[PDB]
Amino acid sequence: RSYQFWDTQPVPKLGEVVNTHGPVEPDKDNIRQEPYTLPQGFTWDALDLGDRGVLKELYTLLNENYVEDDDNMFRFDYSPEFLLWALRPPGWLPQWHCGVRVVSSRKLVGFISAIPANIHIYDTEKKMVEINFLCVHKKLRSKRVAPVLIREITRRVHLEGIFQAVYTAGVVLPKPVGTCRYWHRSLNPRKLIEVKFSHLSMTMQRTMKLYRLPETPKTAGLRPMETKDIPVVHQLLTRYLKQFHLTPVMSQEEVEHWFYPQENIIDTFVVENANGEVTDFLSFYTLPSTISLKAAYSFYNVHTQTPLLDLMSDALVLAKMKGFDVFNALDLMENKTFLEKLKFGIGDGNLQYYLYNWKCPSMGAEKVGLVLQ
Ligand SMILES: CCCCCCCCCCCCCC(=O)SCCNC(=O)CCNC(=O)[C@H](O)C(C)(C)COP(=O)(O)OP(=O)(O)OC[C@H]1O[C@@H](n2cnc3c(N)ncnc32)[C@H](O)[C@@H]1OP(=O)(O)O
C-alpha cells in the first residue's frame, strides 16, 4: 500500500517473508558530505546536551510533541537527567543528537538521535545504532520532515562506518522483525481511576484489595545494586540473553551505565544469597506521564536461582514502595510466564521492532531480548 519513503529504503517489503540473514544493500564506500536539504526556513543544529539551556529546549520539545499514549490522555514527561541517561551512553557522538531549528527564530522544531549498540541478531553480532526520539513539532506535522530527519541521521551514522540500525515504533512499517504488546499492572489503582488510566469494572474497595501487595519483598537477599555488583550483573546478563534471537551485547562499561541505579531514572536490585553470591537481578526505569502519573517500566530481569515469578512480584513490591502508580512490561523474553499470574492487564497497541539494512526471519515476541527507552 505504497510507503513513499520506506519503499526507497534498504528494508524488506511488507508481506515478503524473509528466510535469509544479511544486509540488504552494499556498504557505501563514499558518503555524501553535504547535509540533506530541509524544507525552506529550517536548518540542522547538533544539540549539545551538556549545555543546560539546550537540554531544556529538547525536553520541552519532547514533553510537548513526543509520543502520546494511545488515547491521548497522557504524554511522557522527560526530565533532563533521564535524557542524559538515554542519549549519552558510552560511545555517544555529538553529531548523532540531531536537531532541526527554525532559521529566523532558532526555535527547536525537530529531533532524532542515534546511540551506538552491539546487537546480536540470530547468529550474527554487529555494531549498530539505536534510533530514538524522532520528534517533529505538532505544527510541522505531515510536511515530510521525518524522512529528512531519517535520511540525515542515516548519513551521519554512515560517516562513522555503521550500516545497520535497530528501532521500534507503534506504527506498522516495512518490515517488523518482531511485534510486542504492552501490559500494565496497577500499583495505586485509586489514583489510576481519576486520570482515567483505568476504570472500575467492580467496586473501588475490592479493586484496591485485588491489587494490594505486601509492604516488603519475599526474596531473601534482595538489595539495591552497588558498584561491586557490576561484573556479576554483566556476567548474569550476557549468559541470560543467549536464549533470545535479538539482544544487546553490552560491555561492562555499558552495564554500569544502563543498570547502575540513579534516583527517578533506573532502579536495579540484585539477589545476594546466603553465600554472598549474586544469583539474580531485576531492573525497571522511571517514566512519568503528564495529565502527574509515575510509571515504572520493566527493563532487564535475570533469574538463575530465584524463580522469575518471584522476582517480578518483588519488583512490583519495590515499585509500589517507591510510589509508582503503575508497572509496565512488554510480552517479550519470558514475560508471558508471569504477566497474567501477576495480574497485568493488556494495553492498547503494538510495539514493532525493526532492523535497518538487515534482512532476517521475523521472530515471536518471546524471542525478542532487547528493551529500549
Ligand atoms: C545505518 C543507520 C540507519 C539509521 C536510521 C534507521 C531508520 C530509523 C527510522 C526512524 C525510527 C524512529 C524511532 C522512534 O523514535 S519511534 C517514536 C516516533 N516519535 C513519535 O511518534 C512522537 C510523536 N509523533 C511525531 O513526532 C511525528 O508524527 C513523527 C516524527 C513520528 C512523524 O512525522 P510526521 O507525522 O509529520 O510525518 P512526515 O510527513 O514528516 O513523514 C511521514 C513518514 O514517517 C513515516 N513514519 C511515521 N512515523 C514513523 C516512525 N515512528 N518511524 C519511522 N517512520 C515513521 C510514514 O510512514 C511516512 O513515510 P512513508 O509511509 O511515506 O514511507
Q: Is 6 annotated in some ligand binding site?
A: yes
Q: Is 5 annotated in some ligand binding site?
A: yes
Residue 372, Cα to own-chain centre: how many angstroms? 2
Tell which residue, 213, 198, 207, 194, has the closest CA to residue 346. 198
Which atom of ligand 1 lies at the shortest distance from residue 136's CA?
A: 26
Buried b / exposed e along 282-308 (16+ C-beta atoms within 10 A): bbbbbbbbeeebbbbbbbbbbbeebeb
Q: What's the CATH number of domain 1-373, 2.40.400.10, 1.10.645.10, 3.40.630.170, 3.30.2130.10?
A: 3.40.630.170
Residue nearest to atom 48 of ligand 1 (CA): 171
DSSP type of residue 211 = H
* Rounded-to-integer distance, Cα 371 and Cα 300, Å: 7
Neighbours of 92 (CB within 10 A): 17
Cite the DSSP H helix spans in the chain: 52-65, 80-87, 145-158, 189-194, 204-211, 230-240, 252-259, 308-321
As a whole number of angstroms, the longest Cα–Cα distance in the chain is 66
- Most informative mutation of 13, 66, 134, 140 for ligand 1 (most atoms within 8 A of CB): 134
Set of cell numbers at residue 15: 508481506
Which atom of ligand 1 lies at the shortest distance from residue 169's CA?
A: 16
Residue nearest to atom 51 of ligand 1 (CA): 169
Beta bridge partners of 181: 350
DSSP type of residue 8 = G
Set of cell numbers at residue 148: 529528512
Task: Report the separation in Å between the CA atom of 175 and the middle of ligand 1, taken as the mean of its atom positions.
Answer: 14
What angle in degrees, to the nearest 10, is found between the helix axes of 252-259 and 230-240? 100
**CA 126 vs CA 19, 117, 164, 250, 251: distances in Å:** 19, 9, 8, 12, 14
Set of cell numbers at residue 210: 485485588
Breaks (C-N over 2.5 A) in the chain follow: 201, 291
DSSP type of residue 227 = G
Q: Is 205 annotated in some ligand binding site?
A: no
* Rounded-to-integer distance, Cα 314 and Cα 207, Å: 20
State which H helix or E strand residue 267 sits in.
Answer: strand 266-272
What angle in degrees, to the nearest 10, is found between the helix axes of 80-87 and 52-65? 100
Tell which residue, 258, 66, 89, has the closest CA to residue 170. 66
Task: Report the separation in Å between the CA atom of 260 and the middle of ligand 1, taken as the mean of its atom positions.
Answer: 31
Contact criterion met (CB below 8 Å) for 119 and 126: yes
What residues are in contact with ligand 1 under a 6 Å CB criterion?
3-6, 65-67, 129, 131-136, 141-147, 150, 153-154, 157, 162-165, 167, 169, 171, 173, 356-357
* Rounded-to-integer distance, Cα 167 and Cα 373, Å: 11
Beta bridge partners of 261: none
Buried b / exposed e along 60-85 (16+ C-beta atoms within 10 A): ebbeebbeebeeeebbbbbbeebbbb
Per DSSP, the residues of 46-114 read: E--TTSHHHHHHHHHHHHHHS-B-TTSS-EE---HHHHHHHH-STT--GGGEEEEEETTT--EEEEEEE
* Rounded-to-integer distance, Cα 319 and Cα 326, Å: 8
* Rounded-to-integer distance, Cα 120 and Cα 335, Å: 20
Residue nearest to atom 46 of ligand 1 (CA): 146
Q: Is 76 annotated in some ligand binding site?
A: no
Buried b / exposed e along 336-350 (16+ C-beta atoms within 10 A): bebbeebebeeeeeb
Task: Report the separation in Å between the CA atom of 169 and the middle of ligand 1, taken as the mean of its atom positions.
Answer: 8
**CA 237 vs CA 206, 283, 328: distances in Å:** 39, 11, 21
Sort strands 97-102 and 42-46 into parallel, antiparallel or unpaired.
antiparallel
Per DSSP, the residues of 146-160 read: HHHHHHHHHHHHHTT
Q: Is 163 annotated in some ligand binding site?
A: no
- Find out whether the peptide bond into 107 is cis, omega within 30 degrees of 0: no
- Most informative mutation of 2, 136, 156 for ligand 1 (most atoms within 8 A of CB): 136
State which H helix or E strand residue 270 sits in.
Answer: strand 266-272
Set of cell numbers at residue 371: 528493551
Q: How many residues in the chain? A: 373
Exp. method? X-ray
Residue nearest to atom 16 of ligand 1 (CA): 169
Residue nearest to atom 52 of ligand 1 (CA): 169
Q: What is the resolution of this structure in A?
A: 2.3
Buried b / exposed e along 26-37 (16+ C-beta atoms within 10 A): eeeeeeeeeeee
Taking the chain, what is the end-to-end CA distance rounded to the nearest angstrom?
A: 30
* Rounded-to-integer distance, Cα 358 and Cα 37, Å: 27
Which atom of ligand 1 lies at the shortest distance from residue 137's CA?
A: 26
* Rounded-to-integer distance, Cα 168 and Cα 354, Å: 6
Tell which residue, 5, 2, 46, has the closest CA to residue 142. 5
Neighbours of 11 (CB within 10 A): 21
HSE, side-chain direction, 13 A CA sphere, residue 97:
22
* Rounded-to-integer distance, Cα 309 and Cα 204, Å: 27
Q: CB within 8 A of 135, min separation 6: which ones? A: 61, 62, 65, 66, 110, 111, 112
Write down the domain spans for the chain.
1-373
CA dihedral 143, 144, 146, 147 (to 10 degrees): -170
Contact criterion met (CB below 8 Å) for 61 and 108: yes
Task: Report the separation in Å between the CA atom of 147 and the middle of ligand 1, taken as the mean of its atom positions.
Answer: 7
